[PDB]
Amino acid sequence: QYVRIKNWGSGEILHDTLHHKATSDFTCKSKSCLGSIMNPKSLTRGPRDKPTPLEELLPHAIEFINQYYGSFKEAKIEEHLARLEAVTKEIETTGTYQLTLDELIFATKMAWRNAPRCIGRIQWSNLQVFDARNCSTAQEMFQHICRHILYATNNGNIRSAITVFPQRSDGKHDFRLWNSQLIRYAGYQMPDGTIRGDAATLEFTQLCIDLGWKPRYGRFDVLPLVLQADGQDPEVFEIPPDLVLEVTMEHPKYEWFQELGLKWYALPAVANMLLEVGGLEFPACPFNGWYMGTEIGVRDFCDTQRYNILEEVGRRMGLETHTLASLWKDRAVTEINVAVLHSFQKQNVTIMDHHTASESFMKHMQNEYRARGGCPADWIWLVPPVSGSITPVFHQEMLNYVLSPFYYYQIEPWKTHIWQN
Amino acid sequence: QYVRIKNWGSGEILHDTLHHKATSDFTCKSKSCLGSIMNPKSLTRGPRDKPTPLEELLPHAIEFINQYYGSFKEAKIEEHLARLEAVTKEIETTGTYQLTLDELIFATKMAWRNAPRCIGRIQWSNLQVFDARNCSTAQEMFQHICRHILYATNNGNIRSAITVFPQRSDGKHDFRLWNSQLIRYAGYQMPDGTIRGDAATLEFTQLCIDLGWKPRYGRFDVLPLVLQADGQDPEVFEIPPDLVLEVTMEHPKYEWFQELGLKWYALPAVANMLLEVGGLEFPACPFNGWYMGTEIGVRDFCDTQRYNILEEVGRRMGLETHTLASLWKDRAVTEINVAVLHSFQKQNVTIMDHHTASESFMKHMQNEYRARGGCPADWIWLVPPVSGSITPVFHQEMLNYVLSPFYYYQIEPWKTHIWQN
Ligand code: HEM
Ligand code: HEM
Ligand SMILES: NC1=N[C@H](COc2ccc3c(c2)CNCC3)COc2ccsc21
Numbered sequence: 046q047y048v049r050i051k052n053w054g055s056g057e058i059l060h061d062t063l064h065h066k067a068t069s070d071f072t073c074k075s076k077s078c079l080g081s082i083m084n085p086k087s088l089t090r091g092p093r094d095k096p097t098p099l100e101e102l103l104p105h106a107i108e109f110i111n112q113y114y115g116s117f118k119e120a121k122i123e124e125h126l127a128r129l130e131a132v133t134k135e136i137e138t139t140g141t142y143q144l145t146l147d148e149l150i151f152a153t154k155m156a157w158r159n160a161p162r163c164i165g166r167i168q169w170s171n172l173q174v175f176d177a178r179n180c181s182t183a184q185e186m187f188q189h190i191c192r193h194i195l196y197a198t199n200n201g202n203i204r205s206a207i208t209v210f211p212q213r214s215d216g217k218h219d220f221r222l223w224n225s226q227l228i229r230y231a232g233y234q235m236p237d238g239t240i241r242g243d244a245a246t247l248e249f250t251q252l253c254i255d256l257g258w259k260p261r262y263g264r265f266d267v268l269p270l271v272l273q274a275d276g277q278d279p280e281v282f283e284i285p286p287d288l289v290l291e292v293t294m295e296h297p298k299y300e301w302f303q304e305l306g307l308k309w310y311a312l313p314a315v316a317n318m319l320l321e322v323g324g325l326e327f328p329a330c331p332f333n334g335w336y337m338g339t340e341i342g343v344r345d346f347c348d349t350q351r352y353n354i355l356e357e358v359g360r361r362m363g364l365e366t367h368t369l370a371s372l373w374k375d376r377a378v379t380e381i382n383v384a385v386l387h388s389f390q391k392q393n394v395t396i397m398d399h400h401t402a403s404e405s406f407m408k409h410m411q412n413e414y415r416a417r418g419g420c421p422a423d424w425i426w427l428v429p430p431v432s433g434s435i436t437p438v439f440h441q442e443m444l445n446y447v448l449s450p451f452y453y454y455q456i457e458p459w460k461t462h463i464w465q466n
Numbered sequence: 467q468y469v470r471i472k473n474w475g476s477g478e479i480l481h482d483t484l485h486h487k488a489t490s491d492f493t494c495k496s497k498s499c500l501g502s503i504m505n506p507k508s509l510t511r512g513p514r515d516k517p518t519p520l521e522e523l524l525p526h527a528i529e530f531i532n533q534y535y536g537s538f539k540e541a542k543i544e545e546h547l548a549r550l551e552a553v554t555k556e557i558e559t560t561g562t563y564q565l566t567l568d569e570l571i572f573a574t575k576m577a578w579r580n581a582p583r584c585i586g587r588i589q590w591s592n593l594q595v596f597d598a599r600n601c602s603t604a605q606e607m608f609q610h611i612c613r614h615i616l617y618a619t620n621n622g623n624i625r626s627a628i629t630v631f632p633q634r635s636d637g638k639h640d641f642r643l644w645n646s647q648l649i650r651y652a653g654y655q656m657p658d659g660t661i662r663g664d665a666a667t668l669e670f671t672q673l674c675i676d677l678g679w680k681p682r683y684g685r686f687d688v689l690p691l692v693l694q695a696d697g698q699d700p701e702v703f704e705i706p707p708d709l710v711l712e713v714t715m716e717h718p719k720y721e722w723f724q725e726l727g728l729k730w731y732a733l734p735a736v737a738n739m740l741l742e743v744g745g746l747e748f749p750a751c752p753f754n755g756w757y758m759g760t761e762i763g764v765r766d767f768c769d770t771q772r773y774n775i776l777e778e779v780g781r782r783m784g785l786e787t788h789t790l791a792s793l794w795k796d797r798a799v800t801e802i803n804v805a806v807l808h809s810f811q812k813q814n815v816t817i818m819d820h821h822t823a824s825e826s827f828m829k830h831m832q833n834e835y836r837a838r839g840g841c842p843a844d845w846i847w848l849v850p851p852v853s854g855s856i857t858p859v860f861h862q863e864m865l866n867y868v869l870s871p872f873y874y875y876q877i878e879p880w881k882t883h884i885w886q887n
């Protein structure tokens with residue numbers, strides 16, 4: 046009937062029934078849980094070489110259409126019935142179908158609403174949709190993307206947006222962004238053997254270089270867009286610098302913080318995921334929202350395999366960086382998080398602290414259970430990378446399932462691509 | 467063949483094969499993950515009213531015996547074969563069997579080694595075992611427990627120990643400790659409506675009172691031991707105060723911290739779990755190790771439903787406790803964690819910071835994969851309640867499964883107990 050869920054901070058109980066609408070299998074087996082796996086098959090939708098079998102497509106198409114018309118406060122059975130028939134006919138005559146802009150807008154928001162790992166979902170209905178389903182070349186992809194970046198950045202007043210490129214046809218003409226994020230810094234292995242920039246993008250940086258991109262050997266070089274249009278080999282496009290808004294990192298007290306020469310970009314945008322809806326698949330649909338402070342202050346700056354600045358900040362603060370029990374790491378990361386927030390704020394760039402975001406998500410989750418008896422949530426991703434139990438989300442039990450529409454991961458494009466030359 | 471596991475901080479890969487030895491089902495379904503559920507049935511072993519069916523017991527008994535003799539570096543097939551036969555005969559003639567002290571010692575350590583939620587498992591082979599399987603009355607239970615507490619506390623130099631009471635027979639003569647922990651503070655609802663003490667023990671405190679315990683209405687009143695022996699109604703036993711070592715909370719810089727009038731006990735001991743081994747069940751087997759600083763500094767002191775001192779410390783530090791984005795909560799909890807560590811250290815009481823414990827667990831996990839191709843681990847419990855990604859455990863993918871021997875949760879005793887009077 047329903048899965049009982051409890052919040053141990055308030056004692057409040059919630060009943061989940063939405064999980065019944067969950068899709069196929071999902072990560073965990075029976076005798077073992079695989080909850081902490083970053084990229085499980087259950088969250089990945091791979092490549093195809095043939096259209097989607099009609100026996101599978103039709104049912105899903107009907108389901109989505111029913112969900113769409115069911116969302117209206119004041120039903121429209123005539124339109125609903127008409128659309129149902131039109132979709133079927135289109136599927137029979139073309140072997141697939143096109144969504145209306147309206148249905149697409151609905152699908153992108155629902156997919157967001159259904160993202161288990163997203164803590165900013167209280168904003169789910171506030172999303173600008175750019176329809177690029179008529180895109181044809183890489184150059185056009187590049188133009189659409191530049192327009193998306195410009196719109197979303199809005200000189201610091203960040204706006205959530207998503208650009209939808211052509212849906213997968215036979216799977217041999219996929220539109221794909223080989224980048225992970227629209228804006229990301231390069232990483233290089235210098236002659237002296239040290240790593241400069243974002244150590245996590247060493248391979249991808251080399252790929253861009255192999256494709257002709259000119260390496261700049263800087264600590265914060267914005268990687269180029271690697272765009273694959275209509276199944277053709279990817280083409281490199283440098284992002285126009287004017288479109289990349291950045292924030293110089295400063296601390297409200299430590300004047301030496303700026304001396305670290307750090308900065309980060311204002312726009313967090315996923316470039317490599319796939320939108321699944323009503324049987325259709327969109328391999329190219331970059332989307333963005335705004336940053337949560339910890340992503341930069343904690344992961345980007347403090348992960349040992351990223352910029353790894355924790356120790357340096359420790360010494361600057363003159364802490365016992367040689368004695369773990371001193372908890373110097375905790376004191377350092379806090380000042381770094383303060384720097385990030387202080388800087389975005391001073392430069393008028395939208396950002397949200399993890400505390401405010403956690404409370405925000407709690408309100409959302411409660412709205413969702415009230416609205417539809419459930420909220421797919423991945424505790425492991427929702428709990429911030431610092432001060433876990435200090436946030437309310439930590440004490441909230443959650444159920445993680447895959448609904449539809451949904452945003453899936455994909456297999457790295459360079460692993461399955463069939464080069465033309 | 468094996469489940470691939472990855473550490474994204476080092477890129478290291480591990481192959482898990484041990485999960486094949488996992489037991490029945492476990493929390494997660496197929497279409498949904500229930501990883502963040504605190505007390506799932508998969509981790510609970512409830513009450514019985516009849517002995518264990520021989521068809522089930524024998525197989526498990528044989529399995530355990532094989533595991534025990536298999537653990538020796540220099541095998542002893544003759545003893546192994548002899549024991550196998552002796553156990554079978556005992557099962558046929560008595561309908562159950564008794565473990566040797568040696569096998570029991572092995573079982574308690576393996577069960578610990580198999581605790582997915584324990585971060586201190588690198589110490590798994592260092593455990594003192596107290597055999598109280600011949601215990602008969604509550605008074606004797608009380609004496610054994612006092613001896614355990616005294617031994618473990620060791621004037622601050624904490625030692626890990628476990629006391630094993632009689633195994634479950636027909637399920638109608640269960641030995642049970644109604645407390646959750648051996649040492650825990652009471653919580654009271656005062657006449658003025660405020661809560662004093664540990665708000666989380668309000669109900670259990672009332673229960674002790676209902677059973678005759680005299681409430682002291684203090685902020686740190688050690689709850690009495692509620693002991694159920696041989697299936698009989700529980701009897702209340704106050705813990706002799708000399709046996710409870712406590713640490714007064716002080717901060718190395720903030721002289722006003724001591725003014726908060728806080729303290730905590732030195733001994734963390736689970737009192738209500740069940741030890742399962744070779745088909746046998748031990749409903750009463752309290753065990754202890756030593757504290758990890760965050761348990762007290764973060765959960766006990768900062769959980770809103772516990773002592774909830776975060777805001778007060780915030781004001782004392784003169785922080786913008788009215789502006790979440792100031793990250794005052796992060797600064798407060800850090801100083802509290804420093805206080806806890808500083809105090810235990812100053813009073814010579816064993817304790818370990820969460821950073822040192824995380825690295826310690828990483829070494830353990832690596833020893834385990836090398837030793838037996840696996841390590842049941844619950845990411846959600848292993849990652850400290852503060853500074854998550856700052857610890858290495860956060861970047862380590864893990865598989866959570868239930869092996870055997872194992873420590874299970876139980877249904878609250880007052881929910882199934884059949885009162886004699
Ligand atoms: C409005 C502001 C938003 C905020 C503050 C927010 C914040 C976050 C954060 C902190 C994460 C964790 C990312 C990581 O750990 O790498 C995340 C993940 C995610 N978000 Fe949101 N989000 C927002 C908007 C959106 C929008 C507009 C979409 C899509 C339409 C979306 C889709 C997702 C998805 C799919 C993930 C998972 C990403 C992955 O698996 O790597 N979010 N978000
Ligand atoms: C030697 C020092 C040890 C340390 C530092 C340690 C630390 C911890 C910590 C921090 C937790 C989390 C508890 C919570 O969040 O409430 C935990 C859980 C656990 N530990 Fe250990 N532990 C140690 C020894 C042991 C021993 C001796 C046993 C048993 C023989 C054991 C069994 C467990 C079990 C079963 C859990 C799960 C408890 C639950 O589900 O509530 N640990 N331990
Ligand atoms: N706030 C968000 N954060 C992320 C995407 O942004 C980035 C930017 C850089 C990096 C990552 C993610 C992943 N770690 C390596 C570097 C996840 O998805 C979304 C979607 C809308 S807002 C948003």
Ligand SMILES: NC1=N[C@H](COc2ccc3c(c2)CNCC3)COc2ccsc21
Pocket residue numbers: 647649650733734735736753754755756757758761
């Ligand atoms: N270090 C440990 N911590 C815990 C048990 O100790 C306590 C003490 C008090 C409280 C809890 C746990 C649970 N939260 C409420 C109050 C879990 O189990 C063990 C086992 C050996 S060491 C150990």
Ligand SMILES: C[C@H](O)[C@H](O)[C@@H]1CNc2nc(N)[nH]c(=O)c2N1
Pocket residue numbers: 080081082083425426427474860861862863864
């Ligand atoms: C192994 C683990 O799954 C991985 O480190 C984690 C946990 N949670 C996360 N949570 C978020 N939000 N983003 C993340 O990258 C990760 N990675």
Ligand SMILES: C[C@H](O)[C@H](O)[C@@H]1CNc2nc(N)[nH]c(=O)c2N1
Pocket residue numbers: 053439440441442443501502503504846847848
């Ligand atoms: C809902 C969630 O499962 C519960 O808050 C958590 C997460 N992890 C924990 N981790 C530990 N070690 N101890 C805990 O009590 C909890 N509770």
